Subunit: 181 residues, 4 copies
Amino acid sequence: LATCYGPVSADVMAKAENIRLLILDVDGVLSDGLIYMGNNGEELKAFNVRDGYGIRCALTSDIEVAIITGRKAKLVEDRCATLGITHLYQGQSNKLIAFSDLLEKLAIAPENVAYVGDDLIDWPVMEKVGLSVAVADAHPLLIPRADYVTRIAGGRGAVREVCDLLLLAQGKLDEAKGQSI
Amino acid sequence: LATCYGPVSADVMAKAENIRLLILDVDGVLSDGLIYMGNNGEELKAFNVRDGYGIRCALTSDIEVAIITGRKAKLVEDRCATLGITHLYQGQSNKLIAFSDLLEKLAIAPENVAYVGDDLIDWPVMEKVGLSVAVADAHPLLIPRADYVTRIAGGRGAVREVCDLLLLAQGKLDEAKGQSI
Amino acid sequence: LATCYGPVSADVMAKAENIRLLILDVDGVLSDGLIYMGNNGEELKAFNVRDGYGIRCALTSDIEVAIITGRKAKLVEDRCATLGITHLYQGQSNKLIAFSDLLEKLAIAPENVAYVGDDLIDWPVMEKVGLSVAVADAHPLLIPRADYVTRIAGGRGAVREVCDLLLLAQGKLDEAKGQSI
Amino acid sequence: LATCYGPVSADVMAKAENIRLLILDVDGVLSDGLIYMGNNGEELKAFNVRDGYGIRCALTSDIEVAIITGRKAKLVEDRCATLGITHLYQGQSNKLIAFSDLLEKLAIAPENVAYVGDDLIDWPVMEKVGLSVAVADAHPLLIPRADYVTRIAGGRGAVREVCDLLLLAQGKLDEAKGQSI
Ligand SMILES: [Ca+2]
Ligand SMILES: [Ca+2]
Ligand SMILES: [Ca+2]
Ligand SMILES: [Ca+2]
Ligand SMILES: [Cl-]
Ligand SMILES: [Cl-]
Ligand SMILES: [Cl-]
Ligand SMILES: [Cl-]
C-alpha cells in the first residue's frame, strides 16, 4: 500500500494488479486541458515527457496502452507514433463506441482495463472498467466517482503516476525501463 | 446553495436561474490572459477543453453564448466554429455597443444576461446585466463589483464553472450533455 | 498608502508620484521568462493583456514607456506596435548605454524614471532611477535591492501593478483609459 | 553555507567547489517537461532566460556546460548556439555513452562533474558524478538519490540555482557576468 506518491488502498492495488490495458483521455489527462490555436489554422498541444517514460515502461512491461479522445488532430497521431501507441480513437465523444470496439479486437475483459479521465464525458467508460482513475484536477463531479484520484495534475505526470501504480501492483516497477520522450 | 465548487448565495442562484444569454470576454476569461507572438507574425491563444464542454452544454440547454473582445484574431473565429458559437464581436473596446446589439438581435432583457469578465474594461457591461461574474484572478478592482466571483482562474475552467452554475440554477445540470473540445 | 495590491510605503508612493518615464525589461517582466523555440527556427513569446491595458493607461496619462532587453526579436517590435511603445532597445546586455540614450533623448532626470527588472543584469540601471522595481519572482539576489517588490509575478500582471501604482500616486488611476490588448 | 535559495550542507558545497563540467538534461530540467506538437509536424520547447544567464556565467567562469537528452530536435541545437554550448548529445537512450565521451574529450574525472536530472533515466550518470542534482519537481523516486535537491522547479530556474551554487562555492558568484537570453 506504500507508493512514491503516497499510500493507496488494498482495493486499488488489487484492481491495478489485474490491469492488461490502460486507456487514456488526451485533453486534461495527457495535457493540462489547453488547445493552442493560431491565425493560420495552426494547432499545438503539449505533452509531458515524464508521461512518455511511463507509457514506454507500460508498453515494454506487457501493459497495452490506448487513447480515446473527443477532439481529432494529426499531432495526436504523431505523439502516439513517438511513444509506440497503436490504438487511437479520435473524434469520439460517445466513448463507449470506441471502448466496445477496442475490447472486442483485443479480447480483454473490462475488469482488466484501467481508464484515466478528467471530465463527465469520460464517466460512462470509467463506470465499466476494473480501475477508474480521475486526475487530481479533474472536474469536481468526476472526482468522487473514480476508484483512484491521482496526486498529480493532468499534463503534469498524472499518467506517469498511473503507469507507476500499475507497474508497482504487478511487481514490474523496479525493473521497468523507458525513455523520457 | 451547495454547488460542486462551493456554496453560493440564494441571490446568485436566483440571478442564474433567469439567464438566457451568457456573454464572455476572451483574454483572461477563456484564456489565462496570454498572447503568444512570433517573429513571422504568428499568433496563438490557448483555450480550455473543460470550458468547451460547458459552452456545448449551455448552447444545447437553451442558453445562448456570445463573445465580446478587445483584440481581433482569426483564431478566435476558429474557436467559435469548434464550439458552435454564432455571436462573436472582436476589436471592441467599447463593449456597450456589442451588448446593445445582442439585446436587439436576441430580443432579450439585460436581467436575462450574464457576463464573465476579468478587467475594468468589462465593468460597463457587467454593471447592466442580471448576473455579473469576475473570474478568481480578475483585476483586484473588478472583483468586489461582481455578483459572483468564480473559484477557478481565467483559462482554467472559470467559464465551465459559470456554465455549471447556470445549468444547476435552471435544473438542467444532470441532463446536460456536451463535448470536451 | 493603500493600493488594490496591498499597502505601500510613503517613500514608494512619493517616488511613484514623480515618474515621467517607465522602463521595462521584457523576459521575466512582461513575460514569465520563457523563450519558445521551434525546429524551423520559429520563436514565440507570451505577453499579458492585463499589462497591455496598464501600458495603454500610462501612455495616455503622460507617462512614457520604454523597453530595454538583452534578446532581439521581431515579435517584440510587433508587441510594441500594438501598444504604441516607440522607445525600444533590443540586443542590449549593457543596459546603461540604452538608459543614457533615453534620458538624453527625452530630457528627463533619473529620479523621474521607474525601472522594472527581474535579474542582476537590470541592477546597474535600477540603481540609478527614482523608483526601482523587482517583480515578485525576480532573482532572489535582486529582490532586496529594489525600492518596490511587486505582489504579482513576471508575465502575470507585475507591469499592470506598476502602471496602477504610478497612476494612483499621480491621481490619475480613476480616470485612466486603456485597451486590454 | 548560506545561499540565496537557502542553506546547503558543507558536503554539497565542497562537492560544488570541485566542479569543472556541468551536465544538464533538457526536458524537465531546462524546461518544465512539456513538448509542444502541431498538426504540420511543428515542435516547440520553452527555455528560461534566467537559466541562460547562469549558463553564460558558468561558461565564462571556467565551468564547461554539456547537454545530454533522450529526444532530438533542431531547436535544441539552436538553443545551444544562443548560449555558446558546444557539447550536445541528442537522441541518447543510454546517457552513459555521452558521459564517457565527455570524460574522454575533456580529460576530466567524474568527481569534477555535476549532473542535473529529473527522471530515472538520469540516475546512471548521476550515480557516477561528484555532484548529482535532482530538480525540485523531479520524479519522486529520483529525489532522495541526489546530493542536492533544488528549491526551484525544472524550467523555472533550477539550472540557474545550480549555476549560482557552483559559482558561490568557487568564489566566482560576485564577479560572474552573463546575458539573460
Ligand atoms: Ca478531457
Ligand atoms: Ca480580459
Ligand atoms: Ca529579464
Ligand atoms: Ca528529463
Ligand atoms: Cl474527450
Ligand atoms: Cl477586452
Ligand atoms: Cl535582459
Ligand atoms: Cl532524457
